[PDB]
């Protein structure tokens, strides 16, 4: 099972080094094969003008070929690149999992923590089971990633 | 039969912006003969109202012929980005609008995050990229060419 | 009899349409109170991506305007509010200028439940009655019951 | 070298994983220089979506810390930089405080070709040599020929 790991964390040197590996490892510990686009497609700096299109199509192909997206949606607002990747995944009926350990709210509605469009690929009732608020919660057996694999 | 454009924007969140910014954009698009689906105009005390709105706009994106995405702001609005991502995966026509002179980018080719342009051609993507309301009418940009050619 | 000076901090000058359509109605609503409005994009001529030769002078001119104003009227629309406006608002707090905030955007971008935005934005406002300094529509600017009018006539 | 007080403004206390993993190495880097670090999340206890009757005290405590510090070390990562950091940075500029910026985020969020961010962030810096106060990595906080080090002496 393949999870595309969409995040803004590859943009900060400290975040790329410290925040992503514990997330990657939590997902692998479930049995998941993890596609992390920043390393997988080598976007390590302000992309040169002649490599940007290639980087874009590579990330696009991974979203089309994965089985689920694990979208890190921290920030005010969530990262625009993550959001494009999230909309692709929804449109392609891929499995959808959201991660937000940022306690700030950035929402246009009183029902969801974020803009209601991010949850358009999640059920009306138990969308909370797909919404992870802590790295240590990724392992949880009562949450939709585990049940997705079992 | 008019081509259908879904007009994604954050302009419905501000009272003044909804009233003053969106009508001129709609008019410019309609002057091209387009049928405009503007989600704020298309749209309350219920519990499931947010879910129903998400499903309603999702249906509209699925059924449009193209998206015209207002990508002003730093960064572009996350709801527009989700809708733009849907439109790219569903092979809809893609047009971007930004009259904001600020750059919010991860690369030197594009003035925005490169994934916003992933559904556009490698060369000539500028022809789909509108930088002023006055430019929407241009017979030399992709919207007119797509309506005719 | 010198008019009171309001510095109108906003991100609206970055967008051609916003600059042309959103700012003049706000300027008028303030001028209708007898206020002299300092709108930095027009005053200090930041009309496109500033050339390198010029960005320092734009910064110092806006900075000096904040120093010389009597109050700041901060457009704090957006998720999150604009970083330039926020710098100009922090300056105005520190310099004991009058503070008024404008947000007609109904989205919330906050780190707390007491205030609709980041808590620091209200650090220069009283603990009780801060809502009086927080405007949520251009039409509300005129309110003889809100803080801007009371500051002018007080 | 003198034991100056640095206010470490950042958005990193908002995320559980960032508060735990990203702040301590930055605090330790500043403390390796002999600086007294005032980190507002720990020091004024903002740990979650703040309770309404506590929010005003948090704002006033962070404001007082900015008033009583010697300089600000502003984490200005993100698109755009955090509005709370930006308010606290505007205060520091107007309060005559030493100004140090850092960003290891390689994205651009700018209104000008001279600076990688909104030009107002760099207003309290000099026209020539602002790069001195701009740290793009954590190994660079150490460096004796940047701004922090030199300020700690003269
Ligand atoms: C998908 O595209 C973006 C550019 O690499 C990146 O953020 C990834 O999430
Ligand atoms: C699609 O974008 C709109 C504004 O962000 C929102 O309604 C979403 O449905
Ligand atoms: C201060 O106000 C504006 C908001 O970004 C900015 O241009 C500066 O000129
Ligand atoms: C000052 O810094 C923090 C970052 O936003 C803000 O919440 C306030 O504590
Ligand atoms: Zn939002
Ligand atoms: Zn960006
Ligand atoms: Zn915020
Ligand atoms: Zn910016």
Numbering used by the authors:
A (entry chain D): 4 to 153
B (entry chain A): 2 to 44, 49 to 154
C (entry chain B), D (entry chain C): 1 to 154
Question: Can you list sentences taken from the study reporting this PDB entry?
Answer:
Here, we characterize the structure and function of a thermophilic dNDT, the protein from Chroococcidiopsis thermalis (CtNDT). Nucleoside 2′-deoxyribosyltransferase (dNDT) enzymes catalyze transglycosylation via a covalent 2′-deoxyribosylated enzyme intermediate with retention of configuration, having applications in the biocatalytic synthesis of 2′-deoxynucleoside analogues in a single step. The reaction catalyzed by dNDT proceeds via a ping-pong mechanism, with the formation of a 2′-deoxyribosyl-enzyme intermediate covalently linked to an active-site glutamate.13 Transglycosylation occurs in a stereospecific manner, preserving the anomeric carbon in the β configuration in the newly formed 2′-deoxyribonucleoside. As with other NDT enzymes, the active site of CtNDT is formed by residues from two monomers, and therefore, it is only fully formed in the dimer/tetramer.
Although dNDT enzymes are selective for 2′-deoxyribonucleosides, molecular detail underlying this preference is lacking. We therefore determined the structure of a ribosylated enzyme intermediate by cocrystallization of wild-type CtNDT in the presence of Ado. Residues D82 and N118 are in close proximity to the 5′-OH of the intermediate (3.3 and 3.5 Å, respectively). D62 is in very close proximity (2.6 Å) from 2′-OH and to 3′-OH (3.2 Å), and the proximity to 2′-OH (absent in 2′-deoxyribonucleosides) can lead to less optimal positioning of this intermediate for nucleophilic attack by the incoming nucleobase 2. An important observation is the positioning of Y7, likely polarizing the –COO– side chain of E88. Y7 does not directly interact with ligands, nor is it at a close enough distance to clash with a potential 2′-OH in the ribonucleoside ligand. One possibility is that Y7 restricts the movement of catalytic E88, but this optimal positioning for 2′-deoxyribonucleosides results in clashes between D62 and the 2′-OH of ribonucleoside substrates, leading to a reduced catalytic efficiency with these substrates. However, an over 100-fold difference in kcat between 2′-dGuo and Guo (6.9 ± 0.7 s–1 at 45 °C for 2′-dGuo and 0.06 ± 0.01 s–1 at 65 °C for Guo) indicates that nucleobase transfer is unfavorable with ribonucleoside substrates.
